[PDB]
């Protein structure tokens, strides 16, 4: 007769009733995404609608159990997630407005952009594949032309839509008792239950700002070295004493700095560690790639992959003209119906991402034992962190030698491992400032911290203060640069990237110290180290059922954003690079004026 038992019975009904709807939606989505055709394209409509209606009905019904008298923490968190009705908590007019805004953003993303009539032959630099990595070659003026054209084609069109989205979402969050949309985002990382392990939502910002400062010298020296090493696409306005333009750094927005690789590695005589020649010579296909990747997780004690994974999953030869989006995907359906969506070709990136997707699937089957509202990563950035740490370890030269893809007599030295460290530091060290500044700008805007003064100048000065890159041309408020990115256009979480970046190296150092290793971290292979696998499984099993503080402290000693493992991994690079920066000074001029 007590409220607790009634809530227990209601959750026992809801967890069973949600499984069939979730499986229907997942299977319809998988079948549609495997091959785009009308007969299964139309299925996704009803599949989504039925699931949304059932969730809305359950959320409306879940109201009569108050949250005050709940004493069981499991059902407390379950109801807190369930009582978070989301888009169903407010009126219908705002619901359809938000749906229309999301549809407009999706159409803007899907619709391409064409150049001026003087050269309309090719204007699709996005492409349905990995070709988006390389957009323009070693250029100086038409690269900024492409940059400004894309910015003018996105921001001038999406500024008022984003402003109205911000207004309506702030109203939503205020209705749901949160301070703002940033409060709603931070609520995922907050724990208000068990004492001692408690973490408030307002502590994440200070934790991030405290953990970012311990790596500022590393980023400063790396950026100074890169700027000195460019030397070719020199800034025509500012001498190399000052800062550098932002467009040259690889991608469209500079999120990743892999493209700069070929422009800055000093030891060109020593080739990068490659297995492609052995990959082709030994007749390696996708099946062999995935078998080899599975052996890695089998060695560390993780269970054998379920039979039927290869049967159900598709990974080669799309065949149909309307090919699927070849981006990697890991699909979890019901229970035991784990599968992958892949476009394997024998390359570096595919081999690297195979382990990332394997880690995704492994985390999924590790936390599958939890109830429906709990089978997920503890933090928004835990899943990618688990994927990337396994992705980062198998690429060790020792593992390649053990596999046989590398020469048995091949010897490493202070010339090759430094190149490996530089290559993996371009894709990690430079990504932290971008994510950090983007998320802090997001939290400032969504909470109304900034005034109506044009947010673009604040964003530019903030990026040049953190990322240390000056914008090429001045801009007014008519542009909206961050929305040009997919995860801002579709309103996805962004701090998960920073959490992934730090947690990857935290668990790496923990499991590698558990892996009885001596010397630098980047040479240790966690293969045949069962204790590291058990330590990782200690946290992988919990999922969202336990506070993330418990999931982080039970493996690594610290409870918060401790960044020492990253520096302990990348210290040899820093020590070697200090010799190069013996003359190359460190420090950028934030007061730089490109217009002058």
């Amino acid at each position: 007769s007590t409220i607790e038992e009634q809530a227990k019975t209601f959750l026992d009904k809801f967890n069973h009733e949600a499984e069939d709807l979730f499986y229907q939606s997942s299977l319809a989505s998988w079948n549609y995404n495997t091959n785009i055709t009308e007969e299964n394209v139309q299925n996704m409509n009803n599949a989504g609608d039925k699931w949304s209606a059932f969730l809305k009905e359950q959320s409306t019904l879940a109201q009569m159990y108050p949250l005050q008298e709940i004493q069981n923490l499991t059902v407390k968190l379950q109801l807190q997630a369930l009582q978070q009705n989301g888009s169903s908590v407010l009126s219908e007019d705002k619901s359809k407005r938000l749906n229309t805004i999301l549809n407009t953003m999706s159409t803007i993303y899907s619709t391409g952009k064409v150049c001026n009539p003087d050269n309309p032959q090719e204007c699709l630099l996005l492409e349905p594949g990995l070709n988006e990595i390389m957009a323009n070659s070693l250029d100086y003026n038409e690269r900024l032309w492409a940059w400004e054209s894309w910015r003018s084609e996105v921001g001038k069109q999406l500024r008022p839509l984003y402003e109205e989205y911000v207004v309506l979402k702030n109203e939503m969050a205020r209705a749901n008792h949160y301070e703002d949309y940033g409060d709603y985002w931070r609520g995922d990382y907050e724990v208000n239950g068990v004492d001692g392990y408690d973490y408030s939502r307002g502590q994440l910002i200070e934790d991030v700002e405290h953990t970012f400062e311990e790596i500022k010298p590393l980023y400063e020296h790396l950026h100074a070295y890169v700027r000195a090493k460019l030397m070719n696409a020199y800034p025509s306005y500012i001498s190399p004493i000052g800062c550098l333009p932002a467009h040259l750094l690889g991608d469209m927005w500079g999120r990743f700095w892999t493209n700069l690789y070929s422009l800055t590695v000093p030891f060109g005589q020593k080739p990068n560690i490659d297995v492609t020649d052995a990959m082709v010579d030994q007749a390696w296909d996708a099946q062999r790639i995935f078998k080899e990747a599975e052996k890695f997780f089998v060695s560390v004690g993780l269970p054998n992959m379920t039979q039927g994974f290869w049967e159900n999953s598709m990974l080669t030869d799309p065949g149909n003209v309307q090919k699927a989006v070849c981006h990697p995907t890991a699909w979890d359906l019901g229970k035991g119906d784990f599968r992958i969506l892949m476009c394997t070709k024998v390359t570096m990136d595919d081999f690297l991402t195979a382990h990332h997707e394997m880690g995704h699937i492994q985390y999924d089957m590790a936390y599958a034992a939890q109830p429906f509202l709990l089978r997920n990563g503890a933090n928004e950035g835990f899943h990618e962190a688990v994927g990337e740490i396994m992705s980062l370890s198998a690429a060790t030269p020792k593992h390649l030698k053990s596999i046989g893809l590398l020469s048995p007599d091949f010897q490493e030295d202070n010339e090759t491992e430094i190149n490996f460290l530089l290559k993996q530091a371009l894709t990690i060290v430079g990504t932290l400032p971008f994510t950090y500044m983007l998320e802090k700008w997001r939290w400032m805007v969504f909470k109304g911290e900034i005034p109506k003064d044009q947010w673009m100048k604040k964003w530019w000065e903030m990026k040049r203060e953190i990322v240390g890159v000056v914008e090429p041309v001045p801009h007014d408020e008519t542009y909206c640069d961050p929305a040009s990115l997919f995860h801002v256009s579709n309103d996805y979480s962004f701090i998960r990237y920073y959490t992934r970046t730090l947690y990857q190296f935290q668990f790496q150092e923990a499991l590698c110290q558990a892996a009885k290793h001596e010397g630098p971290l980047h040479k240790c292979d966690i293969s045949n180290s069962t204790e590291a696998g058990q330590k990782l499984f200690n946290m992988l099993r919990l999922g969202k059922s336990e506070p993330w503080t418990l999931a982080l402290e039970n493996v690594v000693g610290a409870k918060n954003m401790n960044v020492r493992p990253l520096l302990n991994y990348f210290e040899p690079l820093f020590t070697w690079l200090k010799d190069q920066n013996k003359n190359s000074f460190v420090g950028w001029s934030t007061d730089w004026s490109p217009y002058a």
């Binding site: 035991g336 119906d337 784990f338």
Partner: protein, 98 residues
């Protein structure tokens, strides 16, 4: 959806006790007189077996072969084990208890 299971009951079923009835279960503080509603849920639910489910959710057929002995003659036995028969030889034999 031809398989169903019960999810709510007032008391734990006694050994081998069966309750096939489908009366509305009252988990709330007030009766609902057979009307489905808040805290009054249908005590039967469907599996919805799909054929792409994993091993942990695939439909497993379960048979519980139970043996019962009471104050009655044992009319069911399993002595399905017999050898050949040879005559004109001094041998051991067990003819159905003889």
């Amino acid at each position: 959806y031809n398989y169903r299971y019960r999810l709510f009951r007032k008391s734990k079923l006694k050994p081998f006790e069966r309750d096939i009835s489908t009366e509305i279960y009252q988990a709330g503080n007030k009766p609902c007189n057979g009307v489905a509603g808040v805290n009054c849920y249908f005590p039967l639910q469907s599996y919805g077996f799909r054929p792409t489910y994993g091993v942990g959710h695939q439909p497993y057929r379960v048979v519980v072969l139970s043996f019962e002995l009471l104050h009655a003659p044992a009319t069911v036995c399993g002595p399905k084990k017999s050898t050949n028969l040879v005559k004109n030889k001094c041998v051991n034999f067990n003819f159905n208890g003889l």
